[PDB]
């Protein structure tokens, strides 16, 4: 159960482990991964102009803070056969910080 974090450390966590494939803001370019704007309160594989794996669309989960934290532990376990080649944010306070920044930077 995620509760709160620091969008300051959450930003520095993103810049090192997320920024290579992703972009936040409104109207951000699709790089390797999709643009994460408005991800919270939006179903998996709904970003316009991006080609997702069948599995990402199959999952059909409304992205919430609890759904995201379970996913960011092991992305390949939560969604099997996904093209997100990321290990995972194992340390919970790392996820809690990231989601706090991600809940703000995705609007
Ligand atoms: C590549 C080097 C990636 C890194 C680092 C991270 N992500 Fe990723 N992500 C990547 C891909 C290729 C995809 C597409 C998934 C597919 O199977 O098609 C994604 C997807 C996401 C999603 C879901 C997208 C959606 O449902 O609309 C999320 C929420 C996501 N990625 C988050 C995320 C975060 C928070 C990361 C770092 C901390 C991160 N990704 C890293 C590729 C890569």
Curated annotation (Swiss-Prot):
The gene is CYC1. It comes from the Eukaryota. Heme c binds at residues 18, 21-22, 84. It comes from Saccharomyces cerevisiae (strain ATCC 204508 / S288c). GO terms for cellular component: mitochondrial intermembrane space; mitochondrion. GO terms for molecular function: cardiolipin binding; electron transfer activity; heme binding; metal ion binding. The lineage of its organism: Eukaryota, Fungi, Dikarya, Ascomycota, Saccharomycotina. Pfam families: Cytochrom_C (PF00034). Electron carrier protein. The oxidized form of the cytochrome c heme group can accept an electron from the heme group of the cytochrome c1 subunit of ubiquinol-cytochrome c oxidoreductase. Cytochrome c then transfers this electron to the dinuclear copper A center (CU(A)) of the COX2 subunit of cytochrome oxidase, the final protein carrier in the mitochondrial electron-transport chain. Isoform 1 (CYC1) is the predominant cytochrome c during aerobic/normoxic growth. Present with 7330 molecules/cell in log phase SD medium. This is Cytochrome c isoform 1.
